[PDB]
Amino acid sequence: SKVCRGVIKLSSDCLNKMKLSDFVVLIREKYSYPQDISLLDASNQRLLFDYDFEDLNDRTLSEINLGNGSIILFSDEEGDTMIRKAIELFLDVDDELPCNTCSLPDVEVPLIK
Amino acid sequence: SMSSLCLQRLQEERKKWRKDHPFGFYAKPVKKADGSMDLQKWEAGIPGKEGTNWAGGVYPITVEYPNEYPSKPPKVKFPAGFYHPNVYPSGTICLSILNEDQDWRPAITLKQIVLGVQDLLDSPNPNSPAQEPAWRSFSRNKAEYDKKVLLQAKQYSK
């Protein structure tokens, strides 16, 4: 009940071309996260990207084993008083939306202590 | 099977560590087959104190977090066969702040743990005989003990 939630609608084509670095850019600017973030695979609980771990920066979403029905956790990792609430993101890829589709859900994510 | 509080607290631990960790120590989550990190298993290194027989060595530990962390303490291990009166043959360190029934409290950071382990190196605790041969040497053949320690310092040279 603490983590915010939303479903991303993706194209099967988009999942193979989407770069992890830009995927982070998209999520950060939609929900007003700060610079220092961390990105987990919420199912198997692997750490895939953060402010220091940039090994996977260049890989595509499929190249880091994210597919249909994978869930992502995105957290505020800045260590300030006001912290942006964590959002959990489901990955629903359907057949077929226009290719190169990555529509992030409208979610009211608050600033908490 | 990690609780969301465990995930939250582990990400914060990695962050506090980045900002503030003791000089000469290192601690980093393990990398897995797929190239990703495992937040539950960390590799760290403990430098021996200068002006002691442990000087010059950096001693490797693994910090393994239970699914119930921070309710339950991490498991900290030197390599199996590591030589110290308070280290089991398996490599498990005996420290009261790592015991759920003793001095462990959820507020205990990775910093406090690694400093505690470092203090243990040169000051073995008599209420924790965990390794028989090492305890025997320490108690009644200090020259055989010191020598073994100096060898181990060289073995784990920086």
Write down the architecture of domain A4-113 according to CATH: Roll (3.10)
Judge whether B94 counts as a catalytic residue.
Answer: yes
Give the residues after which the backbone of chain B is interrupted, taking a C-to-next-N distance over 2.5 angstroms as a break: none
Which of B18, B19, B36 minimises the CB distance to A47? B36
Nearest CA in chain B to A48: B36
Interface test with B, best of A37, A47, A53 (most B CBs within 10 A): A47
A18 and A101 Cβ atoms separated by less than 8 Å? no
Enter the resolution in angstroms: 2.3
Answer whether B65's CB lies under 8 Å from B6's CB: yes
Bond into B85 cis (ω within 30): no
Q: Is B97 on the interface with A (CB under 8 A)?
A: no
Domain map of chain A by residue range? 4-113
Inter-residue contact B17 to B27 (CB < 8 Å):
yes
Q: Which of A40, A22, A37, A4 is nearest to A112 (CA)?
A: A4
**Domains in chain B and their CATH numbers?**
1-158 (3.10.110.10)
| Backbone φ, ψ for residue B29 (5° rounding) | -55, 145
Distance, CA of B23 to chain centre: 16
Q: What stretch of H or E contains B17?
A: helix B4-19
Largest CA distance in chain B: 50
Q: How many CB atoms lie within 10 A of CB A103?
A: 12
Roughly what angle, to the nearest 10 degrees, separates helices B132-140 and B142-155? 120
What are the chain B neighbours of A77 within 8 Å (beta carbons)? Answer: 11-12, 15
> CA A77 from chain center: how many Å?
14
Cα separation of the two ends of chain B? 37
Under 8 Å between Cβ of A6 and A90: yes
Q: How was this structure determined?
A: X-ray
Could you say which of B4, B18, B39 has the minimum Cβ distance to residue A47? B39
Give the separation between CA A59 and CA A57, rounded to whole angstroms: 6
CA-based angle B62:B65:B69, to the nearest 5? Answer: 155
